[PDB]
Amino acid sequence: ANPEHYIKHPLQNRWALWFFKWQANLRLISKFDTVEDFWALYNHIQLSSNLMPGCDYSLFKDGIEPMWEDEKNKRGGRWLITLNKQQRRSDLDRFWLETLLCLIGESFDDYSDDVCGAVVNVRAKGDKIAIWTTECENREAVTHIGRVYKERLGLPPKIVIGYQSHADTATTKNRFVV
């Protein structure tokens, strides 16, 4: 039966979508905490592939700013996916959507609590996507998140991805690899 009042399906966490065009240029677009509200937001906004050079989207848990200096990010780091310039057409939007689904779906088992959010950088040199985690020394969590994320994106067996601490990016060698 189609009810007169449809009840949405609540997500484990509330999420906030951000847009970058330094801390002046950040802008909170929208927040959501149901699956249906996620889809309504995703359906309405521009694809990452259609953004201007130097823009970012970020999706982070409610109350975490998408910046190194936030308390949940300070000690953390990121699993970085680097795309080449040709991959903008074939892979960018596809990888970004799947990243969003890994986040809102809590796809990393017990270690989804370590996940702070994700960022996509739209750049002329080549696009970048990253999952940001809260603590770079949580080796078991960082390792599990990396393996699952890489395999969810369907990245070639040949290529390796790397985890950088935000500390080493701020002063970059890989702290972990999968």
């Binding site: 399906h9 889809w39 689904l101 809590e106």
Partner: peptide, 12 residues
């Protein structure tokens, strides 16, 4: 809470 399948199922 939700599998990948369930998230997509709820895109209407």
């Amino acid at each position: 809470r939700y599998s990948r399948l369930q998230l997509l199922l709820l895109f209407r």
